[PDB]
Design an enzyme around this catalytic site. Structure first.
Site, mmCIF file in Angstrom:
data_model
loop_
_atom_site.group_PDB
_atom_site.id
_atom_site.type_symbol
_atom_site.label_atom_id
_atom_site.label_comp_id
_atom_site.label_asym_id
_atom_site.label_seq_id
_atom_site.Cartn_x
_atom_site.Cartn_y
_atom_site.Cartn_z
ATOM 1 C CG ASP A 185 -0.186 -0.143 2.511
ATOM 2 O OD1 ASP A 185 -0.012 0.875 3.213
ATOM 3 O OD2 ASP A 185 0.249 -1.265 2.827
ATOM 4 C CB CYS A 238 -5.695 -1.386 -4.354
ATOM 5 S SG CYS A 238 -6.234 0.248 -4.916
ATOM 6 N NE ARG A 258 -2.472 -0.814 -3.003
ATOM 7 C CZ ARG A 258 -2.620 -1.491 -1.862
ATOM 8 N NH1 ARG A 258 -1.844 -2.544 -1.596
ATOM 9 N NH2 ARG A 258 -3.530 -1.106 -0.981
ATOM 10 C CB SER A 259 -7.338 0.957 -8.262
ATOM 11 O OG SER A 259 -7.576 -0.277 -7.609
ATOM 12 C CD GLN A 283 -3.949 8.536 -2.213
ATOM 13 O OE1 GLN A 283 -3.611 8.752 -1.047
ATOM 14 N NE2 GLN A 283 -4.728 9.364 -2.891
HETATM 15 C C1 LIG Z 1 -11.440 4.374 8.741
HETATM 16 C C2 LIG Z 1 -10.872 5.600 8.059
HETATM 17 O O1 LIG Z 1 -11.593 6.302 7.328
HETATM 18 N N1 LIG Z 1 -9.602 5.930 8.273
HETATM 19 C C3 LIG Z 1 -8.974 6.963 7.445
HETATM 20 C C4 LIG Z 1 -8.280 7.958 8.376
HETATM 21 C C5 LIG Z 1 -7.491 9.013 7.640
HETATM 22 C C6 LIG Z 1 -6.034 8.946 7.748
HETATM 23 C C7 LIG Z 1 -5.255 9.925 6.981
HETATM 24 C C8 LIG Z 1 -5.966 10.914 6.168
HETATM 25 C C9 LIG Z 1 -7.423 10.989 6.072
HETATM 26 C C10 LIG Z 1 -8.193 10.006 6.834
HETATM 27 C C11 LIG Z 1 -7.974 6.284 6.543
HETATM 28 O O2 LIG Z 1 -7.153 5.496 6.983
HETATM 29 N N2 LIG Z 1 -8.024 6.557 5.246
HETATM 30 C C12 LIG Z 1 -6.999 5.979 4.355
HETATM 31 C C13 LIG Z 1 -7.658 5.708 2.987
HETATM 32 C C14 LIG Z 1 -6.727 5.047 1.989
HETATM 33 C C15 LIG Z 1 -6.098 3.766 2.298
HETATM 34 C C16 LIG Z 1 -5.191 3.151 1.326
HETATM 35 C C17 LIG Z 1 -4.979 3.860 0.078
HETATM 36 C C18 LIG Z 1 -4.126 3.207 -0.898
HETATM 37 F F1 LIG Z 1 -3.346 4.260 -1.597
HETATM 38 F F2 LIG Z 1 -3.030 2.409 -0.256
HETATM 39 P P1 LIG Z 1 -4.970 2.155 -2.152
HETATM 40 O O3 LIG Z 1 -6.241 3.073 -2.878
HETATM 41 O O4 LIG Z 1 -3.799 1.657 -3.337
HETATM 42 O O5 LIG Z 1 -5.612 0.768 -1.454
HETATM 43 C C19 LIG Z 1 -5.597 5.158 -0.220
HETATM 44 C C20 LIG Z 1 -6.508 5.789 0.747
HETATM 45 C C21 LIG Z 1 -5.793 6.911 4.213
HETATM 46 N N3 LIG Z 1 -6.022 8.197 3.940
HETATM 47 O O6 LIG Z 1 -4.642 6.494 4.316
#
Ligand SMILES: CC(=O)N[C@@H](Cc1ccccc1)C(=O)N[C@@H](Cc1ccc(C(F)(F)P(=O)(O)O)cc1)C(N)=O
Ligand SMILES: CCCCCCCCO[C@@H]1O[C@H](CO)[C@@H](O)[C@H](O)[C@H]1O
Length: 285
Positions: A186, A220, A226-227, A267
């Site tokens: 990730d 992903c 990744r998608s 990302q």
């Molecule tokens: C439960 C929940 O909503 N938790 C939020 C809390 C949060 C943290 C930072 C900023 C904003 C929100 C959360 O973890 N969101 C994640 C969402 C997220 C996770 C992984 C990826 C990723 F690129 F790997 P992929 O699309 O290749 O699977 C892209 C976006 C984050 N921003 O890292």
């Protein structure tokens, strides 16, 4: 021809040596479009979303053909010039696996491209919605579907599976090709440009990206990093094959266009760089 590749390679080299990916990537983020996600934020849809910060825009979300709750966290990316559509979705939650397969059936998809692992960073980032060798047959709850594992070929950087999806009500069955790229962390990049291309061309040769089938379903964990990287590389290689001058492909413009359909595509600046690298590498073929 050699001039197009020469320009492509030098350009990449110029951006790389000057480490200019960060800024390009910053302009893309700063210029990305923002559309409403009203349905996604509806209370009833709370446990259908893996993250509150990742939602599909209303205008391009995918609607389940059901009447109960047609909401799923998946967006329709449609690229007209390249003539390809992709569905980008989050990794199914334990309660949205039926929905995931319902969407695949209703959208008539032939292929599913998975870019994450079930457990990432210590937690479940994707419920295993496909069957294992031991229990090769899964029945999905109130979505009336049946899935069976026909074959599994585990390779070094990815795994390919043949699945049989059946509508229990009509008894129609369909072949689903599952493409799991198992080594893409990730927020990171793939193993190498070659394993990635080898993977992408494998999805291409399967006939899963042809207009004869519904759009390929790509996911992903969140369905944007990744998608988005996978889809931007495919589309750019497509434009490079369709245009009189492949060197006119505008990577930032193509990603901004994709971003109108789903937020967060790509990302990290390294994922943007990798994507660019995968295209000039794939352009050779
Ligand atoms: C439960 C929940 O909503 N938790 C939020 C809390 C949060 C943290 C930072 C900023 C904003 C929100 C959360 O973890 N969101 C994640 C969402 C997220 C996770 C992984 C990826 C990723 F690129 F790997 P992929 O699309 O290749 O699977 C892209 C976006 C984050 N921003 O890292
Ligand atoms: C994702 C792949 C995108 C490939 C687009 C390549 C566009 C090449 O662009 C060209 O590069 C040359 C070499 O630096 C420059 O001299 C030209 O002015 C520039 O237009």
């Amino acid at each position: 021809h050699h001039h197009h590749h020469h320009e492509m390679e030098k350009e990449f080299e110029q951006i790389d040596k000057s480490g200019s990916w960060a800024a390009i990537y910053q302009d893309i983020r700063h210029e990305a479009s923002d559309f409403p996600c009203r349905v996604a934020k509806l209370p009833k849809n709370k446990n259908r979303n893996r993250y509150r910060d990742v939602s599909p825009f209303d205008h391009s979300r995918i609607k389940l053909h059901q009447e109960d709750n047609d909401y799923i966290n998946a967006s329709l990316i449609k690229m007209e010039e390249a003539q390809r559509s992709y569905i980008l979705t989050q990794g199914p939650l334990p309660n949205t696996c039926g929905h995931f397969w319902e969407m695949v059936w209703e959208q008539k998809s032939r292929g599913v491209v998975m870019l994450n692992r079930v457990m990432e960073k210590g937690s479940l980032k994707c419920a295993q919605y496909w069957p294992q060798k031991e229990e090769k047959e899964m029945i999905f709850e109130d979505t009336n579907l049946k899935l069976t594992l026909i074959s599994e070929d585990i390779k070094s950087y990815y795994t390919v599976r043949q699945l049989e999806l059946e509508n229990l009500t009509t008894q129609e069955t369909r072949e689903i090709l599952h493409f799991h790229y198992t080594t893409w962390p990730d927020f990171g990049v793939p193993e190498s440009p070659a394993s990635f291309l080898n993977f992408l061309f494998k999805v291409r040769e399967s006939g899963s990206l042809s207009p004869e089938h519904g759009p390929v379903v790509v996911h992903c964990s969140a369905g944007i990093g990744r998608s988005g990287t996978f889809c931007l590389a495919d589309t750019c290689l497509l434009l490079m094959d369709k245009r009189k001058d492949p060197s006119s492909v505008d990577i930032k413009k193509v990603l901004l266009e994709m971003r109108k359909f789903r937020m967060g595509l790509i990302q990290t600046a390294d994922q943007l760089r990798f994507s660019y690298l995968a295209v000039i590498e794939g352009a050779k073929f």
